[PDB]
Enzyme design. Structure first.
Site, PDB file in Angstrom:
ATOM      1  N   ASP A  10     -30.484 -61.722  43.457  1.00 35.14           N
ATOM      2  CA  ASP A  10     -31.502 -62.368  44.285  1.00 35.14           C
ATOM      3  C   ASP A  10     -32.205 -63.395  43.405  1.00 35.14           C
ATOM      4  O   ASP A  10     -33.217 -63.092  42.769  1.00 35.14           O
ATOM      5  CB  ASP A  10     -32.479 -61.352  44.862  1.00 35.14           C
ATOM      6  N   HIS A 830     -33.755 -64.696  74.896  1.00 35.65           N
ATOM      7  CA  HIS A 830     -32.994 -65.625  74.078  1.00 35.65           C
ATOM      8  C   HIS A 830     -31.921 -66.251  74.956  1.00 35.65           C
ATOM      9  O   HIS A 830     -31.250 -65.540  75.713  1.00 35.65           O
ATOM     10  CB  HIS A 830     -32.383 -64.893  72.889  1.00 35.65           C
TER      11      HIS A 830
HETATM   12 MG   LIG Z   1     -37.446 -61.259  46.333  1.00 36.12          MG
END
Ligand SMILES: [Mg+2]
Length: 1356
Positions: A10, A830
């Site tokens: 990440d 939606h």
């Molecule tokens: Mg993060």
RNA sequence: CGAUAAAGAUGAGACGCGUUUUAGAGCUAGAAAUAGCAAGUUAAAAUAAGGCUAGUCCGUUAUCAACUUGAAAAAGUGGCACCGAGUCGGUGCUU
DNA sequence: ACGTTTGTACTCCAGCGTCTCATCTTTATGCG
DNA sequence: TGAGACGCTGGAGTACAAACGT
């Protein structure tokens, strides 16, 4: 063994999360050896964690300070040049004058001469200061007094103008002149020349209409409005040429022969005015001179507020007027204050702490602060009408040296200096010879394309010298090679060729490149014959024929059929069969035609031996933009032509650079056949080979290109490759830390490569824009939307009533009103269902008073609700309330329903990322991991690099209740990396044929249109890849809801369509993910960094008796002169020594933590022992010195951890592992009103969060126990508990929203203040690093798995 | 599909302030403490300490566990399974 | 038995505006 | 053209009670 695993990452601007997972989505646990002198010999750690670091800074502040340093050095050099001119004659008048000026800063005791700098005695100094109160009185006197002056005073005036010389934004001459008289003369010349339709705006005084503080456009509008008939282009041609440095074209505004934009305040103005006068025919001559005089008068109108008829120094006379009127207003205000308010006199005129006159003069108050302070006093006072008039004009008690002096150009100061030189040239003969020299001192300015004048010891310099001698303002043009420096200025920034990274790139308008574009579009084309459909190849005869007949006769080429027909006038006609070539060729000879038109002879342009002359000419035209450089460079070519073509082609200009060198176009001879790439592009020999085809192998050009690419590249370095990427430096630091983390993780797992690596990078006025769009739609529709409710910016955030407004107060799918009284009537639907794509944004969301418009899984029903809503949507799209894509989706059912191409588009929107920086980091990781080659020299993909977007993992959080609260701890980075890995590896296992769409490398396409070809009767275990619904993650959910009010179940265990491998077990993998997310130990590591930057605070404090002040120079005692204060510690060193303690001269052995300031870092590193004995420590143990950078980790009793903020401040180093139930409860309670889901799910969440109201007390108990264990802030904890007990009887939503705020007490890092319920808890700071010196020092690796614990209690 | 425009990054050339110390004689009453009064706008120098490579250069960006080699670049150093989980613990095999 | 340095607790503060020129990527937008 | 200005976190000064040497 194989040891199959994967790595999730990440990447962020402030953190890098990492996680290692196995094939069962489990994070393995391992025990690691710990080094050091501690008893601990092995510690068990999970293979999940995050690395935290400070954000990388851009090199903007450093560049600005470097430029400021250069400016100060050059200003001091200007003063030194003036002094060394004056010195010889100054030694005959006052030999110590320059010494007294140089030492004027230091105190009377340190002066080697008399205290008074100018005259050296008290009486003459007082008389001088009484005669000339300011320097401007002296300047005006020296301009107009025509008497012999003291040479000291002449030097003081010239030094004041040379030191502060004003701006250089106006090129060319400028002189003092009224604006109204100039406008009258302009109108006079206008009427005289035209003598027809005369614009006579009489009665409208252009003075202060043009001179208004509004912008040039608004002043032009005001002037053009008062003009009776004349409007826009025409009179405003001359008006705008007066007002601005750019003006509209004279072709329409002045009937000129060419499209030449007018100019002002530039060197180009003289050449363009000569060209325009030649084109018009001198009829506009002196009508532009009147406009230029009006331009000068308008420019000087607001900086020289005095009539020029009495003096030749308007600037100094204006400053004297400002001084005189300041004195008059000051004495009038003094008399009025005492007479009306004697109690306020002391506060206004004596108190420097307030914003009165004393604070305005002697204190730190500015002009605006003084005006704001004294305005209500002047209102409350009577008899001050002129004072208020001056105050609203910002013309009350002004100073001569103010912020607004930046508009004064250098020509005004130069005019005063020239006047003084001419006035005092008879009495001082040296000043007559040096007059031009001193003028050159003032006006000299290094060109921006020359840069620093270095000998070679400078990173940033590119200047080349014609001679090896010192550069002065008078021999600058004789020493500096201006043309070579101007060429290098551009050539040091233009990118190199990608194929060969050694040589430069050719200009984009070069002949050899434009011919390349045309011929590379030629050779690939091959017209289809009538006799046989074989396209054959456009042969070289028709190569030359087509370009000479069509390209060489038209800028843009003819049409496809037109170009054919033109050739068919010389070839076979009625046979228009193009080779699928485009309608009009994208290539265009545009520079050859310009050269042929300028040179007025096609033979020069046709001449192939003269191609290098053309090449050098285009390179000169592209490189330079000052036109003196172009004149100097093209002077060498005057022989090839004449003066008319010289000055016609000198004004030509080209921009842009290509992407190929001349080597890649006509340099590489391609081995056999000895012909370059251009020559192959001319005659392919019935092969019709394009540039891309030719640049490949089979002609040996690929071998030499690859040899150059690898040779010049030399592998560079990882730091180098990361350096020249795009994006911010912070993301570059994040990528570098990510790569180092990957290398360390590979080392940890037995030097075994992972199977997969999952890559994700965090990408983290529209409310006002939405309010404006709602207002515009209401105005266009003529609806009383504001009558229902105004567009409240408080409600502009919330999406609930967005439909109540944007959809025209009408249900979207139902032909009636939306009933805005009940917002709960409407239900968000939606357009394209969530089973197709998660388009939660309002582009797809719509509401129809909860009407079941469609009973089908299609977007809307075929005709029906779509048809009825389509007309109102035509109205809304006309008003732009309905978006174009919105209307397309809403009309898709009448457009054939949901197509396979549409579904392919939905899954390519869900999957592919478009950011280039993610592609770069994925390429870096794939190059670092996959390093082995096959026998046939083919790359083998040992690891796969998967790139994911944030939407997938975020939806995984929201659907499966793995909720993230950022404020609790830093574990969410590691959890994001783990879920990154889990989602990525599940997607690659379950959908293997889509690996071309989200994994780096050359992969088989596997077109999704064949995959998404499933129907309502799903094929299941087939090639349809379960892609009817086309939500890529829908396979994670046990039951997929549908918009038709039906639930389609999905089997408990998922598996691949072709291979029989289980990829997701819904009964065990969710529990595994929950367990991993509930793990209390993740490796959170703060990156230790040595602090770099400024030495201290830049504020220069007044003198004190404290020893904390830093001397501003070597021999400036801070007790006498003040100085800097509060330095920045680069790093702290732990020293063990004996210090002089006690009056009895006792060597008490002491262990201390001393911080090393950035200023003292080099001195300490040169000799640490000498530095410590200089500091005051005797008999230092040299081998016991431990360098401790910032964020150095120490471990104490009961697991309490502290990070070293500095030598005298610590930070919190522990992490609170709150249980999963509590963070889920906190997310659900804080997002009570923003659940954003189904009404049944919202009701269930409200019931669950109401049933666990007692969780708040448990969370408070957790915070209290953690704070009593490691935080040790007793008063803050007591205040927190008292505030929580005070606000018990509050609704759960705000209570949990502020319990979230309560977590900053226990957060890792520096302590920060926080507010719970109208009560602010100030930060408790650990300002004593004494308990650290007996703690355990932990040296951590980048992942934190490898450690080295040092017991500092055993050292000493 | 060209083409423009914005944002970001990097470099160069320049202005205007701001701050600091000094120079712009403060007067009167009082022994002083203190008061009443008069004034005030400007200038010089420094503007990261400084460095040598002595230029009208350079000095705040990037890089950043500990330990072992190497001047440096750089290279090298740390067992695995299972049961569990309050910041990691325990058990078994081999080192 | 005081002086004397050290440990909490609180408050305050931190260089800033403008202009000219040039070279790259990367997104986007209106343009076809 | 349109202003929106702000936090951040370490240093420094001040006040006062307490561990601490003689
Ligand atoms: Mg993060």
């Amino acid at each position: 063994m194989d040891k199959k695993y994967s790595i999730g990452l990440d990447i962020g601007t402030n953190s890098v999360g990492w996680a290692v997972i196995t094939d069962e989505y489990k994070v393995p646990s391992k025990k690691f050896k710990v080094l050091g002198n501690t008893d601990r010999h092995s510690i068990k750690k999970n293979l999940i964690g995050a690395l935290l670091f400070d954000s990388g800074e851009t090199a903007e502040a450093t560049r600005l300070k470097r430029t400021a340093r250069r400016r100060y050095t050059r200003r001091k050099n200007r003063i030194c040049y003036l002094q060394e001119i004056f010195s010889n004659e100054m030694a005959k008048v006052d030999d110590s004058f320059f010494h007294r000026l140089e030492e004027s800063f230091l105190v009377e005791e340190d002066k080697k001469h008399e205290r008074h700098p100018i005259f050296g005695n008290i009486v003459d100094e007082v008389a001088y200061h009484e005669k000339y109160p300011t320097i401007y009185h002296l300047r005006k006197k020296l301009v107009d007094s025509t008497d012999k002056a003291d040479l000291r005073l002449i030097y003081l005036a010239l030094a004041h103008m040379i030191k502060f010389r004003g701006h250089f934004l106006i090129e060319g001459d400028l002189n003092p002149d009224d604006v109204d008289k100039l406008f009258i003369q302009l109108v006079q010349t206008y009427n005289q020349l035209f003598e027809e339709n005369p614009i006579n705006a009489s009665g409208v005084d252009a003075k202060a209409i043009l001179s208004a503080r509004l912008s040039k456009s608004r002043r032009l509008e005001n002037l053009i409005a008062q003009l009776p008939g004349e409007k826009k282009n025409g009179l405003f041609g001359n008006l705008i040429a007066l007002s601005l440095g750019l003006t509209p074209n004279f072709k329409s505004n002045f009937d000129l022969a060419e499209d030449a934009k007018l100019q002002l305040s530039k060197d180009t103005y003289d050449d363009d005015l000569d060209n325009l006068l030649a084109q018009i025919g001198d009829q506009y001559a002196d009508l532009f001179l009147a406009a230029k005089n009006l331009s000068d008068a308008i420019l000087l109108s607001d900086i020289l507020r005095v009539n020029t008829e009495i003096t030749k120094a308007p600037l100094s006379a204006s400053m004297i007027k400002r001084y005189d009127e300041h004195h008059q207003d000051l004495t009038l205000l003094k008399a009025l204050v005492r007479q009306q308010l004697p109690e306020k006199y002391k506060e206004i005129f004596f108190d420097q702490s307030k914003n009165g006159y004393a604070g305005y003069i002697d204190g730190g108050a500015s002009q605006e602060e003084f005006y704001k302070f004294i305005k209500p006093i002047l209102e409350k006072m009577d008899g001050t009408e002129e004072l208020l008039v001056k105050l609203n004009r910002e013309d009350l008690l002004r100073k001569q040296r103010t912020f607004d002096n930046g508009s004064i150009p250098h020509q005004i100061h130069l005019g005063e200096l020239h006047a003084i030189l001419r006035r005092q040239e008879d009495f001082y003969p040296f000043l007559k010879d040096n007059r031009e020299k001193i003028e050159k001192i003032l006006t000299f300015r290094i060109p921006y394309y020359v840069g620093p004048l270095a000998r070679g010891n400078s990173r940033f310099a590119w200047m080349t010298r014609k001679s090896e001698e010192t550069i002065t303002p008078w021999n600058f043009e004789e020493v500096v090679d201006k043309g070579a420096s101007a060429q290098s200025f551009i050539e040091r920034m233009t990118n190199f060729d990608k194929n060969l990274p050694n040589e430069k790139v050719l200009p984009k308008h070069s002949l050899l490149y434009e011919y390349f574009t045309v011929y590379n579009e030629l050779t690939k084309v091959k017209y289809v014959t009538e006799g046989m459909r074989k396209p054959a190849f456009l042969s070289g005869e028709q190569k030359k024929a087509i370009v000479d007949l069509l390209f060489k006769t038209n800028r843009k080429v003819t049409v496809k059929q037109l170009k054919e027909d033109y050739f068919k006038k010389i070839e076979c006609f009625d046979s228009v069969e193009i080779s699928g070539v485009e309608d009009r060729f994208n290539a265009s000879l545009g520079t050859y035609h310009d050269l042929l038109k300028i040179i007025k002879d096609k033979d020069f342009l046709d001449n192939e031996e003269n191609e290098d002359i053309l090449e050098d000419i285009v390179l000169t035209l592209t490189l330079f933009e000052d036109r003196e450089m172009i004149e100097e460079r093209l002077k060498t070519y005057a022989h090839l032509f004449d003066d008319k073509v010289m000055k016609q082609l000198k004004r030509r200009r080209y921009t842009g650079w290509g992407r190929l060198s001349r080597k890649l176009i006509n340099g590489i001879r391609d081995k056999q056949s000895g012909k370059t790439i251009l020559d192959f592009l001319k005659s392919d020999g019935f092969a019709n080979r394009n540039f891309m085809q030719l640049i490949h192998d089979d002609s040996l050009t690929f071998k030499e290109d690859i040899q150059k690419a690898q040779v010049s590249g030399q592998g560079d370095s990882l730091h180098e490759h990361i350096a020249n990427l795009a994006g911010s430096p912070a993301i570059k630091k994040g990528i570098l830390q990510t790569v180092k983390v990957v290398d360390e993780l590979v080392k940890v797992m037995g030097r075994h490569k992972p199977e997969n690596i999952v890559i994700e990078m965090a990408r983290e006025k529209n409310s006002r824009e939405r309010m404006k769009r709602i207002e515009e739609g209401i105005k266009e529709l003529g609806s009383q939307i504001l009558k229902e409710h105004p567009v409240e910016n408080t409600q502009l955030q919330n999406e609930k009533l967005y439909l109540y407004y944007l959809q025209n107060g009408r249900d979207m799918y139902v032909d009636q009103e939306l009933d805005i009284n009940r917002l709960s009537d409407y239900d968000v639907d939606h357009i394209v269902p969530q089973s197709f794509l998660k388009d939660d944004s309002i582009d797809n969301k719509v509401l129809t008073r909860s009407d079941k418009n469609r009973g089908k899984s299609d977007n809307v029903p075929s005709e029906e609700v779509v048809k009825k809503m389509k007309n109102y949507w035509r109205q809304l799209l006309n008003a732009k309330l309905i978006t174009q894509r919105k209307f397309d989706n809403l009309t898709k059912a009448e457009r054939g329903g949901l197509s396979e191409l549409d579904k392919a588009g939905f899954i390519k929107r869900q999957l592919v990322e478009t950011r280039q920086i993610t592609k770069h980091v994925a390429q870096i990781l794939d190059s670092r991991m996959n390093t082995k080659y096959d026998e046939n020299d083919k790359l083998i993909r040992e690891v796969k690099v998967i790139t994911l977007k944030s939407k997938l993992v975020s939806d995984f959080r929201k659907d499966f209740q793995f909720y993230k609260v950022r404020e609790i701890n830093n574990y969410h980075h590691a959890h994001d990396a783990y879920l990154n890995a889990v989602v990525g590896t599940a997607l690659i296992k379950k959908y293997p044929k889509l690996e071309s769409e989200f994994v780096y490398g050359d992969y088989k396409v596997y077109d999704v249109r064949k995959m998404i070809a499933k129907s309502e009767q799903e094929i299941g275990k087939a090639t349809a890849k379960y892609f009817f619904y086309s939500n890529i993650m829908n396979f994670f959910k046990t039951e997929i809801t549908l918009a038709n009010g039906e639930i389609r179940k999905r089997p408990l265990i998922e598996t691949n369509g072709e291979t029989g491998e289980i990829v997701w077990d819904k009964g065990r993998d969710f529990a595994t993910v929950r367990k991993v997310l509930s793990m209390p130990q993740v490796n959170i590591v703060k990156k230790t960094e040595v602090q770099t930057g400024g030495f201290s605070k830049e504020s220069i404090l007044p003198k004190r008796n404290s020893d904390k002040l830093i001397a501003r120079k070597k021999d400036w005692d801070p007790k006498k002169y003040g100085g800097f204060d509060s330095p920045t510690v680069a790093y702290s060193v732990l020293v063990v020594a004996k210090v002089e303690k006690g009056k009895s001269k006792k060597l008490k052995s002491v262990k201390e933590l001393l911080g090393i300031t950035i200023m003292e870092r080099s001195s300490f590193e040169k000799n640490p022992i000498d530095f410590l004995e200089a500091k005051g420590y005797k008999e230092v143990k040299k081998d016991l010195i431990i360098k401790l950078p910032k964020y150095s980790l120490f471990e104490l009793e009961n697991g309490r951890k502290r990070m070293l903020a500095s030598a005298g401040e610590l930070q919190k180093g522990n992490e609170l592992a709150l249980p999963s139930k509590y963070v889920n409860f906190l997310y659900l309670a804080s997002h009570y009103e923003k659940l954003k889901g189904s009404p049944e799910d919202n009701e269930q969440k409200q019931l669950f969060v109401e049933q666990h109201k007692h969780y708040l007390d448990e969370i408070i108990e957790q915070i209290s126990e953690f704070s009593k264990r490691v935080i040790l802030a007793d008063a803050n904890l007591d205040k927190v508990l008292s505030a929580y007990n005070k606000h018990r009887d509050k609704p759960i939503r705000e209570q949990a929203e502020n319990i979230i705020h309560l977590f900053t007490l226990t957060n890792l890092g520096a302590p920060a203040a926080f507010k719970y319920f109208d009560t602010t808890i100030d930060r408790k700071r650990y300002t004593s690093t004494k308990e650290v010196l007996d703690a355990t020092l932990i040296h951590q690796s980048i992942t934190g798995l490898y450690e080295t614990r040092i017991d500092l209690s055993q050292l000493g």
